[PDB]
Amino acid sequence: ATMGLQMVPARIEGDNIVLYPGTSRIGNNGRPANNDPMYAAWLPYYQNRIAYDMAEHGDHVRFWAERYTRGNFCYWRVRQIARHNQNLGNRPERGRNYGQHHSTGVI
RNA sequence: ACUGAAACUGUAGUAGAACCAAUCGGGGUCGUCAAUA
């Protein structure tokens, strides 16, 4: 279960697998370096739900995200999301803390 | 400036000899499963 920290989001694109670390950078061991955020955004899907403006696997999407904190780590919480053609709208304000998930306001 | 006639292409001969539809295989048995937050 510790091995999941060492995995980067990836997409194959032709004969290449292309890594997508996002705003964070791949540390030497493969974990997100120096406590920068998780390589993928978290799309709240079940316990809190962010429908478009429900997204499915492999939807190309454009979205706002907010850096949120829990425990030793932080991540980009998807705040609102649109299909890549649509417009995601104006910058959202400070998100609500969702239990132990605390907003940083970096959006 | 006188049509020849009459005559069974029949008679004898086994599409057959040899070749395995076969070779191997206990109707058997134990460790999880799942990936997030």
Automatic annotation (TrEMBL):
Protein name, per record: CRISPR type III-associated protein domain-containing protein
Top-level division of the source organism's lineage: Bacteria
Section of the entire sequence shown? 229 to 341 of 795
